[PDB]
Design a protein around this ligand. Structure first.
Ligand SMILES: c1ccc(CNc2ncnc3[nH]ccc23)nc1
Length: 167
């Protein structure tokens, strides 16, 4: 039993809710919140900008030190950093950004990072400003992640479409 509430169950291991991931993170304090990161960990907008704003920019400060030491992530890759006031840990995962021309096949590699964590609160990777079709992202999630994932979808309209079209 865990503390996630109001989720619709899609499969054995995937759950989905219309929620603001920031507000859900602050209420649940999950072990892991996933950030929709870019390779530079520049948290300017979308989910990343919102999560970073909620940390009062502490996420960005920590991220800049990470990049200065380690260099950029790979598209499809991830790193574990602090969850600050939102979670124990933040798993920064880089989905392909269609608006940069990145290969959508890398979306499966991105979701594979979730399998290193038993339970996660997450957004749909490569959705929103990353330009992928969220229905495709949900399909890849279900077909790739084997650990327990709680997906927060900010937009109520998209949430209803994802549920109604789910196979
Ligand atoms: C429109 C469609 C999809 C998204 C995906 N981005 C997010 N997904 C979950 N929670 C969020 N909070 C802020 C952003 C965010 N954004 C905007």
């Amino acid at each position: 039993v865990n503390s996630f509430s109001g989720y619709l169950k899609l499969t054995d291991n995937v759950y989905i809710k219309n929620a603001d991931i920031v507000e859900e993170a602050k209420k649940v304090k999950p072990t892991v919140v996933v950030n929709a990161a870019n390779v530079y960990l520049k948290h300017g907008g979308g989910v990343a900008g919102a999560l970073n704003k909620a940390t009062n920019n502490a996420m960005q400060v920590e991220s800049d030190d990470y990049i200065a030491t380690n260099g950029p992530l790979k598209v499809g890759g991830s790193c574990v950093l602090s969850g600050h006031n939102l979670a124990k840990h933040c798993l920064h995962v880089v989905g392909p950004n269609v608006n940069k021309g990145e290969d959508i096949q890398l979306l499966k590699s991105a979701y594979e990072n979730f399998n290193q964590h038993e339970v996660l609160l997450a957004p749909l990777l490569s959705a929103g400003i990353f330009g992928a079709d969220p229905i495709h992202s949900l399909r890849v999630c279900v077909d790739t992640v084997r650990t327990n994932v709680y997906l927060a979808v900010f937009d109520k309209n998209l949430y209803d479409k994802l549920v109604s079209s789910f196979l």
